[PDB]
């Protein structure tokens, strides 16, 4: 039996995502134009996209039930850690199997492996990242499943710097229980099979992905000339 509270949680999350995510991608025009040629020509455009994406994730985080109860410091630590992971998860929607690329409705706004490479990221990140997207795509999650995973991802007790793990864990648990009930009640087999476990595994993959990004950001950021290309929020969230 799917709970009334649980249905409520799902409805909030779908709206939060709808409010914070645009299928149109119109805002992309505002970012400095993509240059595909030239080293790191692209990064200026992608640095902007990551910065834009972080803002969108923050808006989504505010909606999640029980996020507000957490202290501001707890909110900050969670957002700082999961921002890259949430962006990778949310991106999946744009991402397409046909070209192995993130498709934003334009050739300019269509991003591929060599595009990501121009930003200044080693394959060490890219090959696992592409793989991740294919696996996430294979899952063919319901939008409710997609929204729930992002929130569960954001509200993790074990994120570094967390002042209050017990409170953060309780918020996460409510979402985890909501997701588990949805798959059983609302997901038909065979897709439903092992579905929660696979989704949880993706969170594990994200942690590894996140670690790789930090190693890459440090390298790319290490030089001041490159650190200049990034936005002030990217600097605040990732490093400075």
């Amino acid at each position: 039996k799917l709970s009334e509270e649980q249905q409520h949680i799902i409805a909030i999350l779908l709206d939060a995502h709808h409010k914070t995510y645009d299928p149109t991608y119109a805002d992309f025009r505002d970012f400095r134009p993509p240059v595909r040629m030239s080293p790191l020509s692209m990064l200026p455009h992608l640095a902007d996209l990551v910065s834009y994406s972080i803002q969108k994730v923050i808006g989504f985080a505010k909606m999640i039930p029980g996020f507000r109860d957490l202290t501001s410091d707890d909110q900050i630590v969670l957002l700082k850690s999961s921002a890259i992971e949430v962006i990778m998860l949310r991106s999946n929607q744009s991402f397409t199997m046909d070209d192995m690329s993130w498709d934003c409705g334009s050739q300019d706004y269509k991003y591929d492996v060599t595009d990501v490479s121009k930003a200044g990221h080693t394959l060490e990140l890219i090959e696992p990242l592409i793989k991740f997207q294919v696996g996430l795509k294979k899952l063919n999650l319901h939008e409710e499943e997609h929204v729930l995973l992002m929130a569960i991802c954001i509200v993790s007790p074990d994120r570094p710097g967390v002042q209050d793990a017990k409170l953060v864990e309780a918020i996460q648990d409510r979402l985890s229980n909501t997701l588990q009930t949805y798959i059983r009640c609302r997901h038909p087999p065979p897709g439903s099979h092992q579905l929660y476990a696979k989704m949880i595994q993706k969170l594990a993959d994200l942690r590894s992905l996140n670690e790789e990004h930090s190693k890459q950001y440090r390298s790319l950021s290490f030089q001041p000339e490159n650190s200049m290309k990034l936005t002030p929020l990217v600097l605040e969230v990732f490093g400075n």
């Binding site: 505010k62 501001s72 410091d73 909110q75 900050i76 957002l79 929020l233 605040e236």
Partner: peptide
């Protein structure tokens, strides 16, 4: 907290 922008965006 050393995160003025992140805090402001949050509330």
């Amino acid at each position: 907290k050393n995160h003025p922008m992140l805090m402001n965006l949050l509330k």
